[PDB]
Ligand binder design. Structure first.
Ligand code: HDE
Ligand code: HDE
Ligand SMILES: [S]
Ligand SMILES: [S]
Ligand SMILES: [S]
Lengths: 726, 726, 308, 83, 84
């Protein structure tokens, strides 16, 4: 018996705040959280406690500490089959990572629609508000490998596998509403340009290098999604606080056979929130697993990630009523023109048990649709339908990947397909072909119909010649970038300018920076000039005179494109660092901790060492982490209680903690003599917006702090930080 | 509905004789045959009746007859995911075949000991006569591919997977008691020499080619197994009628830790029986699936393959008591010296449901042992231990091949191994390493002990230098070949001479033939002279004077080495062809079928066309096959009843049927006017032993026929066949 | 879509200091640098300038910007074999990364002995001071994936493939002279303990988590290599400024058959130097490719890594 | 991809074209060709866009599909003409 | 034998290298969530060198017991006090 006698090795099977208990496999942490897919996995779940250690063949092992050898100092013998089995399985643990979105974090949950959508789609999972659909969702970055960092600047993937009663539906989306390119034929060119360069394999997790901006400079279609990536969209606070989009126009098909064009949305119920660049970049160093960790811990805490599914719906007759082509994946449909209709809610409420088995082997593909959905001719979507099935043959070892437990449908599946590597299902059908008489033709085809019918494609008219040709309707590149730019707040525009400036400064060939700047001049002059000034480049008279692109269907902004223009802040699940001293004023800490708890905001108690400190009244305060061990990058705000401030007044790490949180625009609250730290961040005596200060933590001190946290960051502090040495 | 109104598409779920019903997956044929392993496969069996046809993702298909195209004569579209999934699975159906033994046929069964063996072994499956152990057995050839023919001249494999309560034990044996070579390092040389030659990949399923005989002539250690292969051992009648052997000395270990050397045997309860060469070779053309079909149909009929497990046991102090080395796998242990102790019975009573999923993916390996067993230093076995684990990484796609349903232990298996391609088991253990405190070190090691203990190697003393050196004690090559030769009947000797003669005639390079004949002269001059004569070679004076090798520990023969020396016939499950005419004497047929039924002998009714014919008394007799459709090759005996013989008397196929049966030494019985056929086989008016004749098919006529059948073939007929042109 | 007229897209094929020129494939940067192994790769090196763009089957492509469709706003057709080859190759680019040392950076070079060692070894690559043996070296971390960061706290790998006249010799060493564990049977237990934990796959490139310290606390044999890992040896400044060791006692065998026990060492001629922890950790975010980059740039500058 | 182990099956010697082949595809299991192109994508400026597309023409031209007229609905339907 | 070579290594380092070793152990063990694991590691450190063990313990808010303070240092390695 190696476990401690007090049982402290084992986390409580109840919801607990981040950091309070060690994290655990979902079925152990939350055994009573269930859904149909989770339950269906029980046949392959393997426990451990009270079982003997064995080989894979079920032979009990006596000594798992030694190889078999001729004498205890002699050579290892080939007959040691226990050693060889154990080392063989180790030697072959790895499988190929995903070609893109290799870095990803996943969870189980469930979806329910708010009302029946039968008037517009026969999809069974949207047919009844009491119909609950298990989901498994993977969030990801795009460029980096499976061992790259979370808080890079990149697009994020948001993939949801819906285990419906009529088959798997996979909605494979991203956190921006468009993509960089128009035709799937170019996807290897684009991806190769953004990925590490082929001679030396650098940089990881970063579009900030020559080949990416070379391609962008030569392919103006990319500029729209580049604007998004350069905005703080490219650096989300959390996968809980980013939007999701299905990228393409698809169709809904109702029982009467009517088709409706649809684009899919996920709205984060926790609000939209992003980091700032210096914070995000430093945090890839201090905690490259920060988003994986934050998701897992939110779910362990009961702060379940919740998203609302929404549809933008366009009638067939309105296909051509926009300035842009609905089938062009570099174009968004502004919500001002076509509102998002709320459809239902998804809650992610349980972590996996084994990350490899459930997360790494999950296969999502946007061709996995169900009756009541269909495709369109969007030429990016069209090529995706080839890729997501092909890629699995190497990644997951063959055509039986749907038998890997996380991938299995909960709906019945029967057909005449046989064999392949790793074949699990043992088919008893006398027949492996149809038509057959020897099994009375079973399993049988099913006509389409209003419910439980066979899949039939919508009979869209095709007419034209066999051509490799881009539609002329796709040939406009600048109006959508411009609409995005004009829709951002002035601080968001600033952060876009700084993203371009930073990225282009890492481009070693200067003519590529110049060429990018020229393209920015075709979008908006103010944007082009501000980036040029940061790169020491001067616009030509001609560039100064490029006329801006047209408005989009008369729009000069759409505030839904901004992260922050319309407040949607939610503090539940956020976290505050509390900087302890060796004699804290216990009444301040009582007021702080209870105020946070009441709003679902977590805390981490930090000091210059581990263990405990004792408050003025004798309360023993447990320390979560050191100032350097849990840097301000990992929190949303910082509070310093009164007490013996001289203990930490001269601690470089403590002061720097405040400087870093200050630079990154985070709310900071200072009680009593903690106000002596005002000198560190240079705060005027009479105070400034975004610094909460009082004689004590009572009264409105916590309310004012929580008000600041609801607005996420103190954007008004931006001119002040500009000169801070931090 | 495509099935016939009368239900005749579906075979009865009851035992039925060969050809009476269409054959069927075993769980449909024999739903109520159960054992722990068959039951445990229920989680993966999939049915079909009354289910809708779907993709693998569970989406119902409406039209499984057409691809999606732009117009009904247009191009196929990339968005046809139903077509691509279906064609993708098809395109990847095949997996690598086994390197050797690729051709094989398998069945489920059970094993039960006759008494407790705890005095000599702690193997749990041998501890009690009540212990029933499920088995899956695969019989195989060695050289040919998975699509090669069954009745080739070759060694056969006989592999048994015991699903014990203490682990999988695989006993991976062959149908001869030795192997061709001494040291595993030469396995690829030997196998490359026997396999099709590398320039042109010829011949399939045959050792009758230059490279095989080249290697043999250069490596006299091969000559013992070569004698077996060249004898009628090389062409068994049926997997039910051959012996099996574990090939190596292994050890039994008992609860006190005492070691006993053991060699394993399987004794076929249907007796020993083989084809003759002409019959076997022609049978590869008429039915290359003959042994696979015969096994499957024997089990369908209730003629379950039964074998008695036998041990030759040698005390540890007796290691050096023979004039050969116990660890030399080109040496057999004569049963006259160490008798076989009969230990239990295995019964094969159910066919698989899906050949690929159960047979093709099954993985046997002789290093799969359990506590109570152990290895020895046999240098062929030692190297096998490496190969059978390594080969599955490509064949079965990775290190989780034990999760392939047929391979799973029924015993518990738990350990800290993780990941690998197509990982099924989802581990919930917080720990993936030991020693660990976080799971209280579970799953835990188990000390060795008398039952349910961990595996510990027998502490054999090793003393010697690190050398690549063959033991001098292995350096004797001719005494065992000679013992084998001297133990054969005169007709078994003639067939061995004929086997060497035929093979060597196919070797193009005549010096290779000459060198092989030189080796034969070192074994037995009579053998050497007879082969030399058929090759047009004359023994030199030196060859004529080679002193024969010594006897084996005083033995100048051992009848246990002969297939036929000691009577061992069983007619149950054999088959007789009955040659019909268009007006059969019903009284003959009634008698024939009644006597055959009483002994469990099957019959096939043959004619010149299909349909039926009508007896003298109006009994309608359904025809099973034509004379050409079901050649005498496929039966054990031929009976021709009386009736309208003029109908068939000048039918060439009918006459030839009897000539071929006659040539291949099969019992023939002729009733009434059927004796007109005596002329086509040149039988004197007064009769001949092995031809049964009478006025009618009375009681005595059938006893005589069945007596011949018990002795398998009419060996006394051999000098008559030279003259028959068939 | 072409190169600038000034030729500034193309790096000079001469040694240049870090940052002065964009970096380039070795055979284009330094085409006059050769050795027997680098030459023998010529059979498979493929250029690009002045060649037509083709499928893998050698068919020239006219339009590499578009899929074949029925009308320019129509569905993509299954007969577009150009699209499907290109996408198929892309869809199958990745192979499994190394179970351990998946993150690593490599270069070509050569080795020669200072004097013949025939008194102690008959190895041909050590027999003559003028026999040059081509090498390929890969430096690595241990725990993290191929896309993890360089300046983590970890042991480093230092693997040299010598292409000798009597066969390949791989000296597969690390930057400390011992290992954590005594018997190979425990390797999967130790590696699983240091690797990201199996429920959530955290942390990448870090032994700072419960399972690693659990294992160490239960297996005191690990303490020696742990001391090395916790020292600044765990955070080298550059692959050029760390020591290498062969980890085990091997044997040398001379022509007379005499065995001598040997342990292998590499001494960095650029000296020993390591970062400090706060700097190493921050550098994993500011430049996760710092060691890869530095090694490439030193070779391009002529600061060739040398080791004794 | 399963039979010959991945997407570099054209590098197996019997499958190799004798014609030139150059493109921006990379990696894959069993990769033989060692690409020296600074670019693995097009369009690119850093290798002056080589290897380059070739217009169709009478000889040594790029492949262009014949511009067959396509007209009808997306159907899973056998032509009556085949019946 | 598990402690003499770690001790030899420790005694061979300069005072600033020793500090960095203390800081590495302290930083790492501060990220170990289960406190008894940190305690057990500090007990192993007390078998190597008490000064090391105390300096780590202090950073982790751990106090060495009397028994731990009394652990006999492992033997020198073949007479060596250090190897630079
Ligand atoms: C709209 C959201 C979106 C878009 C436009 C694309 N990706 Fe994705 N992708 C693969 C191929 C592929 C192609 C051919 C295109 C445009 C033609 C896109 N992508 C753009 C893939 C290589 O087949 C992929 C890699 C592994 C895999 O199974 O599929 C793939 C990944 C991917 C993910 C990750 C899903 C997951 O496994 O967690 C997501 C969210 C996207 N793509 C979104 C996406
Ligand atoms: C004596 C019974 C016996 C003997 C002595 C050998 N084979 Fe077999 N064989 C494999 C390799 C192998 C080696 C290395 C040696 C001597 C060193 C033998 N054989 C002699 C193998 C390549 O690992 C093999 C190929 C597929 C596989 O899984 O293992 C293999 C097959 C095999 C079978 C087939 C079992 C089955 O799949 O049905 C049998 C019955 C034998 N060997 C018997 C055997
Ligand atoms: S998209
Ligand atoms: S054997
Ligand atoms: S080592």
């Amino acid at each position: 018996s190696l476990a401690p006698e007090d049982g402290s090795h084992r986390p409580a099977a109840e919801p607990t705040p981040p950091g309070a208990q060690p994290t655990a496999p979902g079925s152990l942490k939350a055994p009573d959280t269930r859904n149909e897919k989770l339950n269906s996995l029980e046949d392959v779940r393997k426990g451990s406690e009270n079982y003997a250690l064995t080989t894979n063949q079920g032979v009990r092992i006596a000594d798992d500490q030694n190889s078999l050898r001729a004498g205890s100092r002699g050579p290892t013998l080939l007959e040691d089959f226990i050693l060889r089995e154990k080392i063989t399985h180790f030697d072959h643990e790895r499988i190929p990572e995903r070609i893109v979105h290799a870095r990803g974090s996943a969870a189980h949950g469930y979806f329910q629609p708010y009302k029946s959508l039968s008037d517009i789609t026969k999809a069974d999972f949207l047919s009844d508000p009491n119909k609950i659909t298990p989901v498994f969702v993977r969030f990801s970055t795009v460029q980096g490998g499976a061992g790259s960092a979370d808080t890079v600047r990149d697009i994020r993937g948001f993939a949801t596998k819906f285990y419906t009663e009529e088959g798997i539906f996979d909605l494979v989306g991203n956190n921006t509403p468009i993509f960089f390119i128009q035709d799937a034929h170019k996807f290897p060119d684009f991806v190769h340009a953004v990925k590490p360069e082929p001679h030396w394999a650098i940089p990881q997790g970063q579009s900030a290098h020559d080949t990416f901006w070379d391609y962008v400079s030569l392919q103006p279609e990319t500029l729209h999604n580049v604007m998004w990536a350069m905005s703080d969209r490219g650096i989300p606070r959390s996968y809980r606080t980013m939007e999701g989009f299905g990228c393409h126009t698809f169709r809904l098909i109702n029982a009467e056979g009517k088709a409706t064009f649809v684009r899919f949305h996920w709205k984060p119920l926790a609000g939209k929130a992003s980091l700032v660049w210096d914070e995000a970049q430093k945090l890839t160093g201090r905690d490259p697993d920060f988003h994986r960790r934050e998701l897992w811990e939110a779910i362990e805490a009961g702060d379940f990630p919740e998203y609302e599914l929404g549809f933008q719906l366009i009638p067939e007759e309105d296909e051509f009523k926009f300035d842009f082509d609905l089938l062009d994946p570099t174009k968004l449909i502004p919500e001002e023109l076509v509102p998002v209709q709320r459809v239902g809610k998804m809650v992610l409420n349980r972590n996996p048990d084994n990350f490899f088995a459930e997360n790494e082997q999950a296969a999502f593909h946007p061709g996995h649709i169900v009756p009541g959905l269909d495709f369109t001719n969007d030429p990016l979507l069209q090529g995706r339908l080839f890729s997501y099935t092909d890629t699995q043959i190497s990644r997951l070892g063959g055509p039986n990947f749907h038998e890997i437990p996380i991938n299995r449908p909960t709906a019945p599946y029967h057909n005449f397909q046989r064999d392949g590597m790793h074949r699990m299902g043992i088919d008893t059908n006398p027949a492996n072909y149809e038509p057959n008489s020897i099994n009375d033709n079973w399993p049988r085809e099913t006509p389409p119909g209003p419910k439980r019918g066979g899949f039939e494609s919508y009979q869209e008219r095709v007419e034209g010649n066999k051509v490799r040709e881009r539609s002329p309707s796709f040939g406009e590149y600048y109006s959508h970038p411009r609409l995005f730019w004009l829709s951002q707040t002035p601080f968001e525009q600033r952060h876009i300018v700084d993203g371009f400036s930073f990225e282009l400064s890492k481009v070693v060939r200067p003519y590529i920076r110049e060429r990018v700047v020229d393209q920015l001049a075709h979008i908006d002059l103010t944007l082009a000039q501000a980036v040029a000034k940061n790169l020491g480049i001067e616009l030509t008279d001609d560039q100064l005179n490029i006329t801006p692109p047209p408005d989009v269907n008369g729009l000069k902004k759409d505030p839904s494109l901004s992260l922050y223009a319309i407040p949607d802040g939610d503090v539940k699940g956020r976290v505050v660092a509390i900087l302890l001293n060796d004699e804290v004023r216990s009444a301040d800490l009582l007021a702080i901790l209870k105020a946070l708890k009441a709003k679902g905001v977590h805390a981490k108690l930090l000091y210059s060492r581990m263990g405990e400190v004792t408050a003025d009244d004798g309360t023993v305060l447990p320390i979560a982490a050191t100032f350097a061990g849990a840097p301000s990058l990992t929190v949303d705000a910082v509070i310093v209680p009164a007490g013996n401030i001289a203990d930490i007044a001269d601690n470089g790490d403590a002061n720097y903690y405040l400087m870093e949180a200050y630079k990154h625009l985070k709310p900071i609250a200072l009680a009593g003599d903690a106000r002596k730290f005002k000198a560190t961040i240079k705060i005027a005596d009479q105070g400034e917006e975004g610094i909460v200060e009082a004689d004590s933590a009572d009264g409105s001190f916590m309310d004012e702090l929580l008000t600041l946290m609801a607005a996420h960051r103190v954007w008004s502090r931006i001119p002040k930080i500009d000169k801070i040495p931090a």
